[PDB]
Amino acid sequence: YTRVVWCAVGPEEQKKCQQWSQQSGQNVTCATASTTDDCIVLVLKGEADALNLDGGYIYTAGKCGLVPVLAENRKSSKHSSLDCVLRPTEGYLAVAVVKKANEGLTWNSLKDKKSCHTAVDRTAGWNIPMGLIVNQTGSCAFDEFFSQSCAPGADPKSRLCALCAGDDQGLDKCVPNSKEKYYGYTGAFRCLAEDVGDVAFVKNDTVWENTNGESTADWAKNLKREDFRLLCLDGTRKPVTEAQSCHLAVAPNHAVVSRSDRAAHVEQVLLHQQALFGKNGKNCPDKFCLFKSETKNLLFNDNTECLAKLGGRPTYEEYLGTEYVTAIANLKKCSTSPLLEACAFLTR
Ligand SMILES: *[C@@H]1O[C@H](CO)[C@@H](O[C@@H]2O[C@H](CO)[C@@H](O[C@@H]3O[C@H](CO)[C@@H](O)[C@H](O)[C@@H]3O)[C@H](O)[C@H]2NC(C)=O)[C@H](O)[C@H]1NC(C)=O
Numbered sequence: 041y042t043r044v045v046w047c048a049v050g051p052e053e054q055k056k057c058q059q060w061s062q063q064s065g066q067n068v069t070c071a072t073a074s075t076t077d078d079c080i081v082l083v084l085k086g087e088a089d090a091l092n093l094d095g096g097y098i099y100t101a102g103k104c105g106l107v108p109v110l111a112e113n114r115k116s117s118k119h120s121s122l123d124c125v126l127r128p129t130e131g132y133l134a135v136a137v138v139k140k141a142n143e144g145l146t147w148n149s150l151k152d153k154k155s156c157h158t159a160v161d162r163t164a165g166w167n168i169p170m171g172l173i174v175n176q177t178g179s180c181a182f183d184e185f186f187s188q189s190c191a192p193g194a195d196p197k198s199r200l201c202a203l204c205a206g207d208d209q210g211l212d213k214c215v216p217n218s219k220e221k222y223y224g225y226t227g228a229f230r231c232l233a234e235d236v237g238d239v240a241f242v243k244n245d246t247v248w249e250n251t252n253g254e255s256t257a258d259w260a261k262n263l264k265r266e267d268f269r270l271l272c273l274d275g276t277r278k279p280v281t282e283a284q285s286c287h288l289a290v291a292p293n294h295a296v297v298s299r300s301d302r303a304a305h306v307e308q309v310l311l312h313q314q315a316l317f318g319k320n321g322k323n324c325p326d327k328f329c330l331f332k333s334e335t336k337n338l339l340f341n342d343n344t345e346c347l348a349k350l351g352g353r354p355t356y357e358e359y360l361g362t363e364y365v366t367a368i369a370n371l372k373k374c375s376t377s378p379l380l381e382a383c384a385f386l387t388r
């Protein structure tokens with residue numbers, strides 16, 4: 041079985057993956073599920089092989105035995121010309137973000153406001169913010185800390201899904217895939233933009249990429265960096281350029297995961313795949329661009345140069361950073377989920 045079956049979360053991702061299968065002559069094939077958690081289960085069953093994952097999902101899969109194959113990697117300023125696949129990863133910034141126009145809203149007045157989150161269990165969208173809010177307030181009731189949210193993946197009869205828009209017909213509110221208008225990085229920031237929420241937790245890179253003519257997408261052509269601000273943990277606010285000084289935390293980059301018995305096959309298949317279709321591969325754009333989704337972030341984030349190598353053969357823990365595994369761990373004392381419970385024994 042040479043083919044690497046890839047896991048597409050949601051129908052929009054499934055289409056780009058069907059495309060990739062066709063271009064790759066079945067070097068890659070598609071399986072899908074509605075959610076990432078579901079996909080992780082296919083990867084476990086052996087029904088799929090691999091998929092690229094936010095660091096928080098990496099911890100879920102990590103727990104269930106899956107391991108990290110190659111990290112997503114983006115442009116760089118520091119050391120900005122060693123080869124992409126061997127150049128170390130620099131992480132990204134998880135930020136709290138607001139309309140500038142609104143005032144009196146700051147980290148310390150967040151309680152009882154309205155939130156837009158990438159989706160539940162994700163790193164910047166969720167794990168970091170809710171992480172801190174737990175440590176600070178000192179209670180496990182983050183489900184009630186904000187007045188309402190969009191938090192795809194949460195309980196959809198609950199308040200954390202109260203603000204989610206669903207798709208075009210409004211079907212499937214709160215399903216944590218790209219058919220939910222406010223899903224993921226782009227989704228969250230848009231939930232902010234349309235004033236459905238007060239704060240939105242995202243990465244620095246997400247505001248720059250959807251303001252000031254960078255997206256030519258109806259919801260975001262006219263958006264202006266000026267109209268937004270970043271809450272720091274100071275109590276303070278700064279514009280988006282000071283993100284380095286105004287960020288909640290540093291996050292580990294998305295990364296591909298698979299089963300260990302499938303890691304090397306997958307890593308190799310992918311390295312060739314990116315050479316074919318990656319940022320500067322033979323066939324991109326003449327044929328297929330693996331890293332472009334028109335700002336919809338499918339399979340991969342659109343600002344990925346290449347998938348890069350990892351020091352040794354790490355585990356979720358080496359890969360994520362021991363500092364983060366604890367932040368996630370401690371947040372997770374306040375809530376259970378099917379997959380961590382079902383897999384808890386593997387890692388005891
Ligand atoms: C589908 O998968 C295979 C990966 O197994 C790709 O075929 C392999 O492609 C390399 C080209 O990178 C083939 O030739 C190479 O030639 C250079 C010399 O110019 C040499 O340095 C290499 O050692 C190698 O001989 C290689 O033979 C080939 N393997 C097979 C079994 O065909 C193919 O590109 C993939 N196709 C798509 C659409 O992704």
Ligand SMILES: *[C@@H]1O[C@H](CO)[C@@H](O[C@@H]2O[C@H](CO)[C@@H](O[C@@H]3O[C@H](CO)[C@@H](O)[C@H](O)[C@@H]3O)[C@H](O)[C@H]2NC(C)=O)[C@H](O)[C@H]1NC(C)=O
Nearest residue numbers: 115116117120133244245246248249254281282283284285
């Ligand atoms: C937050 O995210 C934004 C966007 O991801 C970052 O801005 C980007 O910064 C890089 C360099 O740090 C820019 O690339 C540069 O391009 C010029 C040529 O135009 C070149 O001379 C430099 O050597 C470098 O390659 C990139 O264009 C820029 N993108 C945009 C749309 O502004 C920003 O750095 C991030 N902020 C923090 C604090 O990390």
Ligand SMILES: [Fe+3]
Nearest residue numbers: 094095163164
């Ligand atoms: Fe993330």
